[PDB]
Amino acid sequence: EQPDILSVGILVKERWKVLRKIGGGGFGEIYDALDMLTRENVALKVESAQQPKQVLKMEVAVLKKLQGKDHVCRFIGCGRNDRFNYVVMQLQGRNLADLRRSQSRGTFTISTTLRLGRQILESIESIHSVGFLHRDIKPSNFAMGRFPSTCRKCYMLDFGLARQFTNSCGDVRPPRAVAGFRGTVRYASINAHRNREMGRHDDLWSLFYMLVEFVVGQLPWRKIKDKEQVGSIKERYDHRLMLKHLPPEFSIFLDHISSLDYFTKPDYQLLTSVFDNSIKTFGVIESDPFDWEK
Numbered sequence: 494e495q496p497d498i499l500s501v502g503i504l505v506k507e508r509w510k511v512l513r514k515i516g517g518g519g520f521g522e523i524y525d526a527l528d529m530l531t532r533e534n535v536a537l538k539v540e541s542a543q544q545p546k547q548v549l550k551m552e553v554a555v556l557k558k559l560q561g562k563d564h565v566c567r568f569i570g571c572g573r574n575d576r577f578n579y580v581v582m583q584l585q586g587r588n589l590a591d592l593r594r595s596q597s598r599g600t601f602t603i604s605t606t607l608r609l610g611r612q613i614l615e616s617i618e619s620i621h622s623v624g625f626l627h628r629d630i631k632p633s634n635f636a637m638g639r640f641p642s643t644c645r646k647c648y649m650l651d652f653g654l655a656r657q658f659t660n661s662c663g664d665v666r667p668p669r670a671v672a673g674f675r676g677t678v679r680y681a682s683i684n685a686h687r688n689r690e691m692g693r694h695d696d697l698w699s700l701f702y703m704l705v706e707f708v709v710g711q712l713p714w715r716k717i718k719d720k721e722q723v724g725s726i727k728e729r730y731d732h733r734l735m736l737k738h739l740p741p742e743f744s745i746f747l748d749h750i751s752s753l754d755y756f757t758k759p760d761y762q763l764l765t766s767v768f769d770n771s772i773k774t775f776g777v778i779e780s781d782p783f784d785w786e787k
């Protein structure tokens with residue numbers, strides 16, 4: 494097998510001391526580093542400068558575009574050399590994929606699900622608003638903050654698979670006839686399965702699948718390994734069945750996203766009202782313990 498892209502102990506740009514590898518999936522590796530300028534721990538993403546698919550150029554572009562917005566890591570630095578490309582950003586805390594897996598039956602309560610859901614929808618509207626599609630919405634791309642002031646905030650952690658979908662003016666770009674999907678089968682919309690150009694609604698489909706998995710603990714295509722077979726299931730599936738364990742207003746959510754296509758801007762305010770109305774109906778308040786606190 495290959496060694497780690499970076500040796501633990503090295504200094505990147507005479508500033509970022511590599512301490513430990515913390516992740517390895519996607520199209521590179523991520524490390525906890527010490528920033529010797531600010532004297533703080535940071536996250537350091539790296540990719541080989543020779544590997545066939547490099548995505549950190551996209552990571553930097555989107556992270557920069559989103560500075561000042563909610564639910565995103567603070568940008569700290571970036572660079573390219575003959576060995577590796579790197580991006581430095583705020584280090585966060587516990588990953589939603591991990592937090593869900595730690596639950597008794599892999600489920601969150603509707604209180605935790607609704608609050609996380611609404612934060613995630615905020616993060617999706619935000620990336621759409623600067624002209625990018627995420628295209629890889631899944632639990633492991635979100636984490637809670639790691640300080641008292643940030644640990645009730647959910648952050649969108651990665652943008653590697655994003656695509657710019659607009660002009661500078663906000664004109665939706667003509668879709669390609671074929672678009673080869675590189676995201677996760679489990680949370681992918683039918684359009685990803687069909688190798689169609691993904692749109693804003695495909696990120697909302699993936700959120701819908703994440704919310705259902707949070708409350709039910711599994712999706713109907715949990716045990717199916719073949720990507721096509723998953724696609725077939727989704728193509729025929731009656732998504733109304735997934736409403737059973739969601740608050741009633743999610744019928745509005747599902748009817749709305751079902752109506753959308755590549756060329757149709759989502760009604761984000763309608764989808765936000767589904768969360769806001771559900772949270773009031775269930776008497777949920779922001780200070781209530783999340784499931785991992787209690």
Ligand SMILES: COc1ccc(Oc2ccc(Nc3ncnc4[nH]ccc34)cc2)cc1
Pocket residue numbers: 515516518523536566582583584585586588590591633634636650651
């Ligand atoms: C499928 O379930 C999984 C997969 C991978 C995984 O590991 C990690 C580890 C780190 C990160 N990312 C980050 N972490 C902390 N601070 C961060 N700032 C920016 C990215 C980042 C994401 C998943 C955890 C759960």
